[PDB]
Design an enzyme around this catalytic site. Structure first.
Site, PDB file in Angstrom:
ATOM      1  N   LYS A 163      17.097  14.388  36.906  1.00 64.33           N
ATOM      2  CA  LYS A 163      18.562  14.444  36.948  1.00 64.33           C
ATOM      3  C   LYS A 163      19.055  14.579  38.386  1.00 64.33           C
ATOM      4  O   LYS A 163      18.499  15.342  39.177  1.00 64.33           O
ATOM      5  CB  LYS A 163      19.106  15.581  36.082  1.00 64.33           C
ATOM      6  CG  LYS A 163      18.894  15.345  34.588  1.00 64.33           C
ATOM      7  CD  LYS A 163      19.988  16.013  33.759  1.00 64.33           C
ATOM      8  CE  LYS A 163      20.030  15.452  32.337  1.00 64.33           C
ATOM      9  NZ  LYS A 163      20.230  13.978  32.300  1.00 64.33           N
ATOM     10  N   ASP A 193      18.264   9.736  36.701  1.00 63.78           N
ATOM     11  CA  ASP A 193      19.495   9.828  35.909  1.00 63.78           C
ATOM     12  C   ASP A 193      20.667  10.379  36.728  1.00 63.78           C
ATOM     13  O   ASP A 193      20.713  11.575  37.029  1.00 63.78           O
ATOM     14  CB  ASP A 193      19.249  10.712  34.675  1.00 63.78           C
ATOM     15  CG  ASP A 193      20.374  10.624  33.646  1.00 63.78           C
ATOM     16  OD1 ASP A 193      21.493  10.178  33.993  1.00 63.78           O
ATOM     17  OD2 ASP A 193      20.133  11.012  32.482  1.00 63.78           O
ATOM     18  N   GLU A 218      19.195   5.324  35.382  1.00 59.16           N
ATOM     19  CA  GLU A 218      19.841   5.651  34.122  1.00 59.16           C
ATOM     20  C   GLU A 218      21.277   6.104  34.380  1.00 59.16           C
ATOM     21  O   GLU A 218      21.500   7.046  35.146  1.00 59.16           O
ATOM     22  CB  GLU A 218      19.078   6.778  33.435  1.00 59.16           C
ATOM     23  CG  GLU A 218      19.664   7.166  32.100  1.00 59.16           C
ATOM     24  CD  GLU A 218      18.864   8.250  31.425  1.00 59.16           C
ATOM     25  OE1 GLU A 218      17.695   8.466  31.825  1.00 59.16           O
ATOM     26  OE2 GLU A 218      19.398   8.881  30.488  1.00 59.16           O
ATOM     27  N   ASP A 241      23.263   5.089  29.280  1.00 61.95           N
ATOM     28  CA  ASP A 241      23.180   6.286  28.433  1.00 61.95           C
ATOM     29  C   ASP A 241      24.583   6.607  27.921  1.00 61.95           C
ATOM     30  O   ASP A 241      25.007   6.049  26.895  1.00 61.95           O
ATOM     31  CB  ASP A 241      22.575   7.469  29.199  1.00 61.95           C
ATOM     32  CG  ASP A 241      22.264   8.662  28.300  1.00 61.95           C
ATOM     33  OD1 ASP A 241      22.564   8.598  27.089  1.00 61.95           O
ATOM     34  OD2 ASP A 241      21.726   9.675  28.803  1.00 61.95           O
ATOM     35  N   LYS A 265      21.479   8.567  22.111  1.00 64.44           N
ATOM     36  CA  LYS A 265      21.606   9.802  21.347  1.00 64.44           C
ATOM     37  C   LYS A 265      22.097   9.544  19.924  1.00 64.44           C
ATOM     38  O   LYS A 265      23.066   8.808  19.705  1.00 64.44           O
ATOM     39  CB  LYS A 265      22.530  10.780  22.085  1.00 64.44           C
ATOM     40  CG  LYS A 265      21.929  11.241  23.419  1.00 64.44           C
ATOM     41  CD  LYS A 265      22.853  12.180  24.168  1.00 64.44           C
ATOM     42  CE  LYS A 265      22.180  12.689  25.432  1.00 64.44           C
ATOM     43  NZ  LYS A 265      21.750  11.553  26.312  1.00 64.44           N
ATOM     44  N   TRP A 320      13.379  12.949  23.518  1.00 69.65           N
ATOM     45  CA  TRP A 320      13.685  14.203  24.198  1.00 69.65           C
ATOM     46  C   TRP A 320      14.216  15.195  23.181  1.00 69.65           C
ATOM     47  O   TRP A 320      15.090  14.854  22.370  1.00 69.65           O
ATOM     48  CB  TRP A 320      14.752  13.993  25.274  1.00 69.65           C
ATOM     49  CG  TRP A 320      15.063  15.261  26.002  1.00 69.65           C
ATOM     50  CD1 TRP A 320      14.433  15.751  27.118  1.00 69.65           C
ATOM     51  CD2 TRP A 320      16.061  16.228  25.650  1.00 69.65           C
ATOM     52  NE1 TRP A 320      14.986  16.956  27.477  1.00 69.65           N
ATOM     53  CE2 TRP A 320      15.987  17.269  26.592  1.00 69.65           C
ATOM     54  CE3 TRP A 320      17.017  16.306  24.631  1.00 69.65           C
ATOM     55  CZ2 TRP A 320      16.833  18.382  26.545  1.00 69.65           C
ATOM     56  CZ3 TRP A 320      17.852  17.414  24.584  1.00 69.65           C
ATOM     57  CH2 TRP A 320      17.756  18.433  25.534  1.00 69.65           C
TER      58      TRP A 320
HETATM   59  C1  0XW Z   1      18.168  14.588  28.910  1.00 67.19           C
HETATM   60  N1  0XW Z   1      19.178  14.515  27.861  1.00 67.19           N
HETATM   61  C2  0XW Z   1      18.638  13.731  26.765  1.00 67.19           C
HETATM   62  C3  0XW Z   1      19.462  15.828  27.353  1.00 67.19           C
HETATM   63  C4  0XW Z   1      20.852  16.171  27.761  1.00 67.19           C
HETATM   64  O1  0XW Z   1      21.647  16.332  26.634  1.00 67.19           O
HETATM   65  C5  0XW Z   1      21.147  15.271  28.872  1.00 67.19           C
HETATM   66  C6  0XW Z   1      20.450  13.958  28.271  1.00 67.19           C
HETATM   67  C7  0XW Z   1      20.413  12.748  29.178  1.00 67.19           C
HETATM   68  O2  0XW Z   1      19.430  11.944  29.171  1.00 67.19           O
HETATM   69  O3  0XW Z   1      21.390  12.502  29.939  1.00 67.19           O
HETATM   70 MG    MG Z   2      20.767  10.401  30.507  1.00 74.02          MG
END
Ligand code: 0XW
Ligand code: MG
Ligand code: 0XW
Ligand code: 0XW
Ligand code: 0XW
Ligand code: 0XW
Ligand code: MG
Ligand code: MG
Ligand code: MG
Ligand code: MG
Ligand code: NI
Ligand code: NI
Lengths: 367, 368, 367, 367, 355
Positions: A163, A193, A218, A241, A265, A320
């Protein structure tokens, strides 16, 4: 089989070893929203949705509860099957995929329990008994990111998400380089990301300076339009994403070949029914994707694991889970968990969970 | 995990009642269907079927169905009778040949529903309706007669008419569509003009230009994806893809570039119900209407189409076309689906909803 | 001269020092399908089609036989000339180019024999008495790929195709780099054939990491759409192979300048009649191409050699033959073979072969 | 001047002589959500947001309240100015423009009261003392739509919107044709609003059949992509309404010249701060637009009238108000109302309203 | 078989004159092949009789010893002179004649095999007063032509529009195909108008404007089919046009594309793309007309819009017995070896040039 009653609950989940730092906003604790659907025969199905704080996406805990009250109020008498459920839900409330997702997960749980098969069977059949996962390193000092990167690689993770953002791009570049020097040679997959945190100016720079580092970018930028801007100017792969907010939108992205893959998600896309269509779409287009959700406990994690098990392993970038950051299991025995960077797929009926019907206290709402 | 224990293949002739059925890309008098019986390790059986509409309509023929099914069947014993494991194994045995793979896919859904005690429409996500609309396909014919049949079919209750055109001067096709429209305008019946790959772009442009007042959709007017792209910005009538929709990948390219406003979709061409249900979900997300058809076939094909059609929002479901009115026999005379009042009652039994005698088609041509 | 009778045969061709490793499916042995056309005066022409296993392309041995049965059944009485042949064939069966190719080749053989001229003359006239070839390296360990590459360059091959895929992209990159290290400075041309095996993610990486290596990327990805996706983002030349399934599709590809060249197979495009149209298109557009087929014995190899001889040498990337992998010649005296990395062009009438009419045993089918 | 306290209320608004029929879903009564901001010196500002049922857009009354609870909880001590407010709001909650709009309106009311000037002055200065409006005909029998069209034209409206959809396109075409037969010759402007209800198939037909009818096609189809699909194939002007979900998306639409104008709602775009920017973008691009909101009482209606007064009249397609459908006024003396198809612009400080601090009962929430 | 000598001649072709340029290729065994190229004056295309001769002198001077086959011929020709397709076409035709004679088969066999024994043609109406065009249109329809090309331009668009409407009124109901040929003569402004005013008239618009770019300009704004003619100057340009779907068909001339070898490739390209085309040339006698007829016979009849011949306007035949001619609006395909012509080797006199 018909829905007789729907009950709604909320529960707090504090971030173990918190906070979890994201460029769009950090999280220290999370309020999850639980759905229990009760069928006319007394059988129950569990669902869950848990936004990762109120600034990551257009979603929050109070919003999940409010939307679920609207949906629950119109659902008694509906058939507990995915298409009848979604058709009825769409007739009660526009959008709010993350709330709809919780009801969808619960219907899949109930459906599988009724027929005596796991959710992964209802999704078309598992291709694997265990799925890969990936580890997400929150925004942190470069040397520490490098240290944890190696640590998580040695723990068995097949992929690492770094991140970035909310600080000068200089530091993000320093971080990705140090992580790369720490894990190069191990074959671990790498995602950088940006969490919507970069201007197109800085995204161009990130790619331009690092052709030698095999990250995918990402969601580096804040909008679909900014992804379109940088796409012809970045020689690194681009993954969507946060912008993948509906099946319609992902179809626009991948048929225009805007991206090379997705972080996806379950809650954002509206549940397992739409996640399954998304999977089929990606398989047809040869586009790798993750099988994630925003946050949550055993219910969310079971849902992600079940869908992940039906994806061709070479396209499945990892499921994840919030599990390592959550200090509780709703089902201590069967709740899924990450072991050696991988997740064993449940084989029981439904989601594979046995949760006491009163676990989450008295209902906040019933209909 | 119920495994496939044995697969048997058969062929059977289906002569066209009141034939021939006339298409621009090739006329048909009688058709050879290819039947698959999958026997599970507990002895439960699932039936599948694929029946190309002659050897020139599409890249598919009866002999090809059998030959591909032999290769697929030879590597399928021991496979799990679930759609994703099935398609993964099938793709590992043979590239393409969707129309052959479709037969095994249908049989697996039949077996799966029987094992679980639920209809195939439940396995596909749940029916939204107990009966589905259909459409009638008028073969290429004399204009005044097309108009007379069009009105007859409207009065039977069909919600939609497909007018087959081509393999003759465009003048005549235009005359036909105008005569048909004059006969049915005001009844609200939906109209499709199917060029069946038979028009040059020259003639497709003319057909639309001369008829702004006629609310047809132009179904597969031209011979290729590229020719559809050619005429798309120059025709003010909606355009539907049919023959060119040869894979999920291709339809994704078509609909996200908004090349078309709808599809004629055939279960065999897309490779079975597993892919057809993904296609359904794609069209729902894009608000694109589509049919739920197959090329031809008996009760097995027709059940498959009816099951998926039942799961489509009725406003997007342009109709499930069945070969049933052109097929003299039912494999299951009691439960075989059939068109009544221009509509089709959805089966409610386990699996496809059919009970067919295991020896209905004689001894196997091939078993593996 | 009309076709009086058509006979069909099948024959097994075991891969010498096999298997041959492809990302889309490996091959240990192959069933070829042979066509004999008998004209009304008793003159015969031979044709052949042999898919490289059932997963490489939409083609298989059983499908070849089945399609040839339909075609043969409606072909007696047709003139033994290319346009009347293809017109009749298209009226009998849609598509199935690989089957139609076998009859096309047989018609060219018969035609050349009637007129007393080689097939290359009928295709417009040979520009050379010997054609270049290229060697296809199966997917293997990088160090061994490098060793074999240098060995084949030393044999005289003017071009090397390195097969890649069905393993992590890191290894494919290691292989292309080591191969390049071995042969750089010899001027041998290099193709990196992904055989539809790479996601767009990995294709971008392959080009991005290797600007210094002068490969062309041959069919790196699984679809025409994915070739379109990576085209503006790869600075290496892109060649189409598997996606070139008709003259129509080739025209789309090369007039939109999607590719810089082609791997082309006679069976995929539907025979010599379409292959010569393809050759003329590439000459007009200055696009280099190979002159290959999937697999086969002397008949296929003769066909490829004849068309290859009519291509301007600077545009002819090589005729790949299965010959080195095939134990037996149908005509040991006249069957073409690779010598010093090149192929001598036959000069006798027709394909330049004399095969005993009973060479393949009794017909499986006659019409 | 800082915010000391925020109070939230809700209130019922039944549709006088309803329902009001929309393709996306009809409405019989609406729950409005009221915000009262109290500054440190005791001065108050009022805001309001009232989605038009839960299926029209991604917004509902319960969602408004839930989002406003989150926003209010972090706003104490914030400066009562538009930019400081929005910056703080965005740091508390992602998206939810319709909720943020209510606080934005309350801030403009408070700001204008502090400075002693009308909101229209704060927005740059009114260009007119009265603004045009347009009448929206709900989905109804074609004959009834034509008569109502005639009555509203004769009443003095400069523009009519005909709501269509949720029935066969044949009936929508009959309706627009009869409306046209009634009002042709009067010069009244005409909009045909599909309310996301048409497939591209039917939108093409609607335009094709009616070149002689000068409607604009307002949001005929369900997505931005579908507007893009029909744009080059429809010779009628296209307006965006529901898809105009942010300033970012509007900029994408109008600079690609996807549309010729907009139906714009203050709540959808996130308040008067964003509406003013939208106004300036339309002026720069010469794109006509309305100044509406989804629904509401005097507070919403005042906000719309204030912004509408600052638009060049030739670009202002009309301010639609819910007022004629709302039985009560919060301020009976000063509440705006439509007379002769037009609206007189308020001239008092702030929104120009005086509402009893207890008008809506005790607060549902305070922060 | 090698080329031993090449002789060039020019001949004034009397009208019912234009300067045609004749090529005789003599093979080492004494076998001869005839070729021909004849521009329609110096302003229709980038080609003229004097240019044909000059280019042919260059080509002839480097061709002795070349193989008399199409690919070796074109390879050598391209190495001697850039472009000049119309000149190269004449040698290409002669090579096909000589090749067919050597093998004892007609040129249509060498081109892949005839699909028909007779081909359709079309009549070209010159620019004339609207009433006259309508009268001739009906006259030519009744003679049996399956297609009518109406030449337009070099006058106000109003009159072109009046002309096309009157022609259509005269011939509607007969099913005759209609082409409106602007001959590069219309601005985009007027081309847009011509289509816009006439949706009810089923013409194709053949080369309405002066450039490829102008065809691209009007393509998305005209609901009538567009055909390319004059702009189709090479196989390369044709590939650009038809794969971008700029046009729905072509008028194609053998000389412009550079001979039968390239015309055959063009035919195959159109068949792959389902694009109709003509099989014409600019002008000429029996040699040019035979060449067009042979290639036309190999085209799928539904895609063959017609072979236009200069024959009815030419007041002589090189071979009165076997020279092709239009009868009832159609052309019988020759069946003898080569082009199917016997022309005396001294028919055109002594060579103007020999190499
Ligand atoms: C890593 N994640 C899947 C968990 C968080 O909710 C952030 C998200 C992402 O990939 O941005
Ligand atoms: Mg992401
Ligand atoms: C009407 N059909 C479904 C039957 C044939 O298979 C042809 C097809 C079509 O729509 O073209
Ligand atoms: C090298 N080949 C020609 C042989 C196989 O058929 C594979 C093919 C290729 O280039 O992919
Ligand atoms: C006319 N409106 C402003 C009122 C409703 O809220 C619907 C809306 C529109 O234009 O669609
Ligand atoms: C009708 N043609 C073939 C003969 C003239 O040379 C004019 C030409 C054309 O179509 O433009
Ligand atoms: Mg069709
Ligand atoms: Mg290859
Ligand atoms: Mg609107
Ligand atoms: Mg012309
Ligand atoms: Ni670059
Ligand atoms: Ni138009």
């Amino acid at each position: 089989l018909k829905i007789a009653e729907i009950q709604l609950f909320q529960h707090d989940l504090p971030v173990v070893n918190g906070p979890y730092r994201i460029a769009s906003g950090d999280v220290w604790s999370l309020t999850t929203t639980i759905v229990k659907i009760i069928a006319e025969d007394g059988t129950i199905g569990w669902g869950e949705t848990c936004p990762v704080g109120p600034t990551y996406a257009e979603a929050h805990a109070g919003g999940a509860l409010a939307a679920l009250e609207v949906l629950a109020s119109g659902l008694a008498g509906a058939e507990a099957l995915p298409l009848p459920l979604h058709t009825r839900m769409d007739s009660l409330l526009c959008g709010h995929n993350y709330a709809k997702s919780a009801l969808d997960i619960a219907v899949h749980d109930l459906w599988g329990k009724r027929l005596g098969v796991p959710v992964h069977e209802l999704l078309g059949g598992a291709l694997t008994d265990s799925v890969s996962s990936y580890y997400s390193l929150g925004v942190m000092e470069p040397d520490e990111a490098a240290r944890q990167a190696l640590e998580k690689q040695r723990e068995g993770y097949s992929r690492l998400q770094v991140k970035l953002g909310a600080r000068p791009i200089e530091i993000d570049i320093e971080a990705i380089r140090k992580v790369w020097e720490a894990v190069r040679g191990t074959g671990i997959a790498l995602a950088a990301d940006g969490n919507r945190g970069w201007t197109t100016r800085d995204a161009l720079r990130f790619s331009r300076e690092c052709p030698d580092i095999p990250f995918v970018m990402e969601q580096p930028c804040n909008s679909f339009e900014d992804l379109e801007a940088i796409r012809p100017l970045c020689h690194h792969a681009l993954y969507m994403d946060e912008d993948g907010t509906s099946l319609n939108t992902v179809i626009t992205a991948a048929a225009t070949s805007l991206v090379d893959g997705f972080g996806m998600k379950v809650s954002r896309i509206g549940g397992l029914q739409h996640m399954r269509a998304f999977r089929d779409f990606c398989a047809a287009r040869n586009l790798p994707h993750t099988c994630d959700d925003a946050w949550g406990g055993d219910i969310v994690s079971a849902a992600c694991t079940h869908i992940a098990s039906t994806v061709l392993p070479r396209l499945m970038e990892g499921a994840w889970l919030a599990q390592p950051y959550v200090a509780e299991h709703y089902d201590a025995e069967n709740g899924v968990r990450i072991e050696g960077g991988r997740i064993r797929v449940p084989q029981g009926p439904g989601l594979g969970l046995t949760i006491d019907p009163e676990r989450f206290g008295p209902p906040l709402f019933s209909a």
